[PDB]
Design a protein around this ligand. Structure first.
Ligand SMILES: [Zn+2]
Ligand SMILES: [Zn+2]
Ligand SMILES: [Zn+2]
Ligand SMILES: [Zn+2]
Length: 195
């Protein structure tokens, strides 16, 4: 249905994550890999090949102030991504994986249509469950917003506004249409490039 596309993803695990998993960077790495495998599987149907270009773990201190308000944190993260992370290695989008509970009890945030933008191609995902698939669905959902998708307002589809108890790995037809609109009206250049 869609032309070949690629999302060269960067993930940053904050200091809260290191604390949560008892300083075990190896365990965090294994966790993110599984998360990405799930994300990758969920994007295949849209002909988007997702890969983890890099993983950063803030084992010393956070490089930005990570706070309970997702909006402020996402903005600081986007500034850091544009001014620092992009200088280290090319990538299409970066997501901050945080252990910190958000102040409005949400579990993620992203910039709509931000894919490829130096500053706005970022997302925020709270490590809200021991079930990695569940957290991967949230990351997939936020990448969805980055890719121009709006909420399904299908209750079990990825872009559902609320996190189902039994989430599926499918994008709604509305979600696919939003993605189509995105490719047509935006058509960001970075995701055309294979790793
Ligand atoms: Zn520490
Ligand atoms: Zn707030
Ligand atoms: Zn959403
Ligand atoms: Zn090449």
């Amino acid at each position: 249905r869609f032309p070949q596309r690629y999302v060269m993803l960067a993930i940053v695990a904050d200091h809260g994550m290191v604390t949560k998993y008892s300083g075990n960077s190896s365990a965090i790495t294994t966790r993110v890999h599984q998360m990405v495998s799930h994300v990758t599987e969920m994007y295949s149907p849209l002909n988007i090949a997702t890969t983890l270009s890099l993983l950063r773990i803030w084992s010393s201190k956070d490089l930005i102030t990570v706070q309970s308000d997702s909006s402020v944190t996402l903005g600081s993260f986007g500034d850091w991504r544009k001014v620092v992370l992009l200088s280290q290695q090319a990538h299409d989008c970066a997501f901050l994986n945080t252990a910190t509970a958000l102040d409005d009890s949400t579990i993620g945030l992203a910039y709509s249509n931000g894919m490829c933008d130096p500053k706005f191609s970022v997302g925020l995902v709270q490590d809200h469950s021991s079930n990695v698939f569940m957290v991967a669905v949230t990351m997939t959902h936020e990448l969805g917003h980055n890719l121009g998708m709006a909420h399904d307002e299908c209750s079990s589809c990825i872009m559902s506004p609320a996190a189902s108890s039994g989430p599926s790995k499918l994008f709604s037809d509305c979600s696919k249409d939003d993605y189509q609109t995105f490719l047509t009206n935006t058509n960001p250049q970075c995701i055309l490039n294979a790793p």
